[PDB]
Amino acid sequence: TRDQNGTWEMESNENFEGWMKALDIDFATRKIAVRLTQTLVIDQDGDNFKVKSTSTFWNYDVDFTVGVEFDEYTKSLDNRHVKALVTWEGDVLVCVQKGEKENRGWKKWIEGDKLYEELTCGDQVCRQVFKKK
Ligand SMILES: *C/C=C(\C)c1ccc(-c2ccc(N3CCC3)cc2)s1
C-alpha cells in the first residue's frame, strides 16, 4: 500500500545518533535527542503530504507534493539549505535532499499496520519502526 496516513508512534529506533552525527548536530542536542520516543503524523491526500515529526524535544514539520521539487531550509534540524524531491519507487516513498551532504534523505514504507523509515546521511542509516495508533 501507498497509503501512509495516520498517527504513528515509535516502537523501534536504530542508529539515530549516527545519523545525527553525520548531520553535525551538536553533542548536547544529540545526547538528549537519542533518548526520546518519537511520533510521526502523516496527512496524505493524493500527492499532497503534510508530515510532522515530534518528541518532547522537537517539532519538525514539512509539506510537499510528490513529484514536485522544492527548496528547503532544514530549520531546527541542521539549519541547511537543500533541494528536496519526494517520489515513489513502487510503494516506497523516497526523499532525496540535494545539498552539502551526500546520500541525504529518507525512505518510508508500510508493512501491515506498521510504518518503516530509513533516515540517511553520508554513510549512516537510521532505521525506525512506528505502529499505527
Ligand atoms: C519523514 C521523517 C522525517 C521528515 C523526520 C524524522 C525525524 C526528524 C527529525 C527532525 C528534527 C530532529 N532534531 C531537532 C534536534 C534533533 C530530529 C529528527 S524528521
> Three-state secondary structure along 68-127?
CCEEEECCCCCCCEEEEEEEEECCEEEEEEECCCCCCEEEEEEECCEEEEEEEECCEEEE
Residue to mutate (ligand 1; options 31, 119, 129; most atoms within 8 A of CB): 119
CA distances from 107 to 72, 95, 131 (A): 17, 6, 16
Distance between the two ends of the chain, CA-based, in angstroms?
Answer: 17
Task: Provide the CA 28 distance to its chain's centre, in angstroms.
Answer: 21
Q: What is the resolution of this structure in A?
A: 1.6
Residue at grid coordinates 541525504: 104
Name the residue with the closest Cα to ligand 1, atom 10.
Answer: 60
CATH number among 2.40.128.20, 3.20.20.100, 3.40.109.10, 3.40.50.2300, domain 6-132: 2.40.128.20
37: helix, strand or coil:
coil
The experimental technique behind this entry is X-ray
